[PDB]
Amino acid sequence: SHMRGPNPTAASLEASAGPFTVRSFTVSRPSGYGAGTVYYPTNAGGTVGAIAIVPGYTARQSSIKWWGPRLASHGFVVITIDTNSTLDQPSSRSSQQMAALRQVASLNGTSSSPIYGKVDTARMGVMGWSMGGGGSLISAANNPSLKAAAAQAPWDSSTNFSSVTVPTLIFACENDSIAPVNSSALPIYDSMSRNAKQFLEINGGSHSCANSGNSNQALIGKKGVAWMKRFMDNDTRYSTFACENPNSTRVSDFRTANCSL
């Protein structure tokens, strides 16, 4: 267990920001990816786990930026990345996500870095949108020591993620016409037998339903923070929120397995 911050409430996890103070910086010399913003917290008590977030095809940090402060304010170091090319495919995106986690761990050891010793480099998570969500699931399949994964509107050329043992949360957008739920998100979710997993489908959601500026930041933010706290911190105070079937008009579908209360 790695418990930091007060006992959460649905209300405080729905809030725009958690208890901790967040400052950010642009990574100076990115190592094995295009660009990175690091978001961190100053007064967490101990060190916090790190999460690397990757956008979709043609997209940049903009699409996924809101997660940086939303997660960091609850006790994580979060790096949002631009890929080497906006036209990088999921396997390449996974490689770059893992290179960003690698560099976050190096900046942890770098006296000139604002996250100097602010990071616990044994507790790492992966997140991403679309092809970046596909990348996150590849990162989880290839690296089972990752503590948690969350993909929003994921897309990959293959829907078989049966090797994934990492607790995985899938955000789906009901009306997605880019990576439709019935051919992408759902099939990907159904492939995972060996892990804690969850599927939350956003009612009437387009492909961008979990991106910066979305109309469900309360519910989506609550779920992603609760999932990452539960599984990255092994913090059982978050079990109620991580596993709950939300009683919301904003949710069109909910599935979960191996998520014990």
Contact 71, 44 (CB under 8 A): no
Contact 75, 50 (CB under 8 A): no
Contacts 24+ apart (CB under 8 A), 257-260: 257/195, 257/196, 257/197, 258/195, 258/196, 258/197, 259/167, 259/196, 259/197, 259/198, 260/196
Closest by CA to 5, choosing from 201, 193, 226, is 226
Annotated binding site for poly(ethylene terephthalate): 57, 131, 155
Annotated binding site: 57, 131, 155
Instruction: Look at the chain and count its residues.
Output: 261
Q: Specify whether 2 is catalytic.
A: no
Q: Specify whether 207 is catalytic.
A: yes
Place of tokens 């979710």: 189
| From 74, 113, 139, 207, the catalytic residue | 207
| From 176, 184, 208, 235, the catalytic residue | 176
Q: Specify whether 130 is catalytic.
A: yes
Place of tokens 């990345």: 81
Contact 150, 127 (CB under 8 A): yes
| From 95, 113, 130, 139, the catalytic residue | 130
Q: In degrees, to the nearest 5, what angle opens at C-alpha 95 toward C-alphas 92 and 89?
A: 15
Active site members: 130, 176, 207
